[PDB]
Amino acid sequence: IVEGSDAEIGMSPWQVMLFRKSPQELLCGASLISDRWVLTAAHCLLYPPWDKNFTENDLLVRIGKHSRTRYERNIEKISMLEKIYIHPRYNWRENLDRDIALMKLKKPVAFSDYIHPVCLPDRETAASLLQAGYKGRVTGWGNLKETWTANVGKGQPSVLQVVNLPIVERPVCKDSTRIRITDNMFCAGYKPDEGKRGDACEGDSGGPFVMKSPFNNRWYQMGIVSWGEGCDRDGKYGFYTHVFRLKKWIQKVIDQFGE
Amino acid sequence: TFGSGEADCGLRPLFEKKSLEDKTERELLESYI
DNA sequence: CGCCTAGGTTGGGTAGGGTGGTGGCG
Ligand SMILES: *[C@@H]1O[C@H](CO)[C@@H](O[C@@H]2O[C@H](CO)[C@@H](O[C@@H]3O[C@H](CO[C@H]4O[C@H](CO)[C@@H](O)[C@H](O)[C@@H]4O[C@@H]4O[C@H](CO)[C@@H](O[C@@H]5O[C@H](CO[C@]6(C(=O)O)C[C@H](O)[C@@H](NC(C)=O)[C@H]([C@H](O)[C@H](O)CO)O6)[C@H](O)[C@H](O)[C@H]5O)[C@H](O)[C@H]4NC(C)=O)[C@@H](O)[C@H](O[C@H]4O[C@H](CO)[C@@H](O)[C@H](O)[C@@H]4O)[C@@H]3O)[C@H](O)[C@H]2NC(C)=O)[C@H](O)[C@H]1NC(C)=O
Ligand SMILES: *C[C@@](*)(O)[C@H](CCCNC(N)=[NH2+])NC(=O)[C@@H]1CCCN1C(=O)[C@H](N)Cc1ccccc1
Ligand SMILES: [K+]
Ligand code: NA
16 A cells, blocks of 8 residues: 555454465455455466466455464454355456455354454445545455555555545546556546555555445455556556456355355 | 344444544544535 | 563563453562
């Protein structure tokens, strides 16, 4: 998260950390949608052009965290994965279209003050909340800057970061980049003239872009950190997987079996 | 199967449930106006 | 007892904390 700020305890209880077993490294963010389902980005698990292709046993997921590196005794909860489901039409060859994946835990997790699921949107939630100018919130333990080049400051936060950002008009998103945009994507962030700052960055992928319904007071996950070009650059906007456009697949998978 | 959690989704134990506002949600709400 | 900074699947923020039990020093 670039230009964000430390999260408050239990502010994003649906936040999940995708962690590699060996070597032990934080791979991505993810989100809790029930006691046994977690949502993340597909490229976090599968990205051939970079030799990436994990399987259930390679990973573990960590829920209820705040601190990036400490093991938070009696608070966090670690769960293995029973199954991984990458969207079947996830386009890793070109533009990360449908950059989404579902991960089923082996054993259902118990909720707590720090562990609680976010709601998935439906047609009305999307129509009412996904509009240019409305703001959503992104969270992650990703980079505080573009670490692939010399820059001042720390690379990783020590605590979960949070930043609020406005959704941007689709034509703007489109003209901001040469990568092909699809309806399964939306972009967000401040425009140069708005003088404000913020964006997601590497290591944040899979993390949720949530919005609060002013109508029922609940938090809905509208997007998933997918990609970008640099971090927090002027004229650039972070890109997010459009969750509601992929809702049919999601529900098809989650409700498929009686287990 | 979905499992537990749908009914109570999106309501945080340390915030909505205790009628407390995080420090920045206000900014969100105001963006809808 | 009041300080100080610390392993562990883990920092030092302090010996609780959003968590359990646990020093060494003056
Ligand atoms: C990223 O990395 C991953 C991880 O490595 C890599 O995965 C590899 O992908 C390769 C594709 O290029 C693939 O190759 C195959 O391998 C075949 C043999 O492997 C299978 O069997 C061995 C041991 O027998 C296992 O170790 C393997 O895991 C693999 O198991 C199969 O896995 C598939 C996909 O998950 C299963 O399909 C699913 O099946 C579901 C239903 O499951 C049951 C069921 O009905 O309940 C389970 C039952 O046990 C089973 N019954 C029996 C009697 O076995 C039935 C039954 O198969 C079917 O019902 C009848 O069709 O299935 C659902 O249907 C679900 O929708 C479906 O997706 C599959 O069931 C499972 N099989 C078994 C028996 O368990 C080779 O045979 C295969 O050969 C093919 O090509 C050859 C030509 O070159 C040709 O000779 C041959 O005839 C075939 O056409 C080919 O080599 C690898 O298997 C796979 N490796 C691993 C470890 O998974 C990714 O590709 C990589 N991705 C990228 C993008 O880089
Ligand atoms: C995997 C995620 O951590 C990461 C999120 C980046 C978010 N960035 C901003 N500014 N909000 N995604 C990536 O790193 C993806 C995966 C592969 C390359 N990539 C990029 O975002 C590239 N920088 C651009 C890109 C290349 C190919 C296809 C799509 C995008
Ligand atoms: K301790
Ligand atoms: Na920008």
